[PDB]
Amino acid sequence: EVIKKDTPYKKRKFPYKSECLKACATSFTGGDESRIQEGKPGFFKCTCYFTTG
């Protein structure tokens, strides 16, 4: 009952995780985080989830 929101990171400089996870929450703006609410980081990429249900 949830969606899958993952953004790309590649590997900008050194591992930041927060710099990528931010892309998810920042990837868009308008609703109360309605689209992510929570997400995790990854190397060369990052996966996020929309706490809905």
Side-chain angles (χ1 to χ4, degrees):
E1 287 179 283
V2 288
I3 97 192
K4 201 171 138 190
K5 286 273 137 174
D6 69 287
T7 104
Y9 193 69
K10 204 191 167 200
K11 43 117 167 246
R12 258 153 172 198
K13 309 177 276 293
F14 258 42
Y16 241 89
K17 311 163 128 308
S18 97
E19 184 119 291
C20 93
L21 178 63
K22 177 173 211 167
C24 237
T26 288
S27 263
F28 219 62
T29 321
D32 303 329
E33 294 180 88
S34 347
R35 262 149 76 86
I36 328 290
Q37 249 176 132
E38 186 196 287
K40 257 165 156 29
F43 78 103
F44 232 96
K45 77 192 98 66
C46 286
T47 48
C48 333
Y49 304 69
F50 171 19
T51 312
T52 354

